[PDB]
Amino acid sequence: WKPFETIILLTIFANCVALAVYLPMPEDDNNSLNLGLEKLEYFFLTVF
Amino acid sequence: RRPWYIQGAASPKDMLILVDVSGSVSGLTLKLIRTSVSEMLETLSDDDFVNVASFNSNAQDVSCFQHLVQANVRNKKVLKDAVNNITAKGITDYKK
């Protein structure tokens, strides 16, 4: 009943922006930013 | 591009073409890199030495040569025929 409808929502909006900056590269290539987002995905999964 | 011009315009060289065959260069840019290497080798006389390595998270030579060869007709032909076989896959690592 606390402002919980503004933190998990804020986290979902911060996580839908961590999917737009992902850059898909042809047939198994990767830069640094994608390797960082792969980590941040663990944080997001654990918070959810 | 004539032999006499290229030989009178610069002293002999030890070129080492270094192709990036990682995944990002796949598609059109690889079709262009093949033609570019094959047109670059065409500017080498018999006093120049050349070898075409490639790298994608792991660097290695592209043919059965392993060192610098003398860039005559047959060696250039083998390097040309070995460049046209490369494919793009992997991660880019410039240090190796």
Helix, strand, coil percent values for chain A (each to nearest 5)? 50, 0, 50
Neighbours of A45 (CB within 10 A): 9
Is B22 assigned a ligand-binding role in the annotation? yes
Residue contact A26–B88, C-beta within 8 A: yes
User: Which residue of chain A has the CA closest to B24?
Assistant: A26
How far is the C-alpha of B78 from the C-alpha of B51, rounded, in Å?
11
- This structure's resolution (Å) is 3.4
The experimental method is cryo-EM
Chain B residues inside the 8 Å CB shell of A29: 22-24, 90-92
In angstroms, the CA B2 to CA B12 distance is: 15
Can you tell me the distance from the alpha carbon of B78 to that of A40, in angstroms, rounded to the nearest whole number?
Answer: 47
Separation CA A39–CA A36 (nearest Å)? 5
- Answer positive or negative: Cα dihedral of B35, B14, B69, B23: negative
Token reading at A28: 């198994």
B63 is in an annotated binding site: no
CB contact (8 A) between residue A29 and residue B27? no
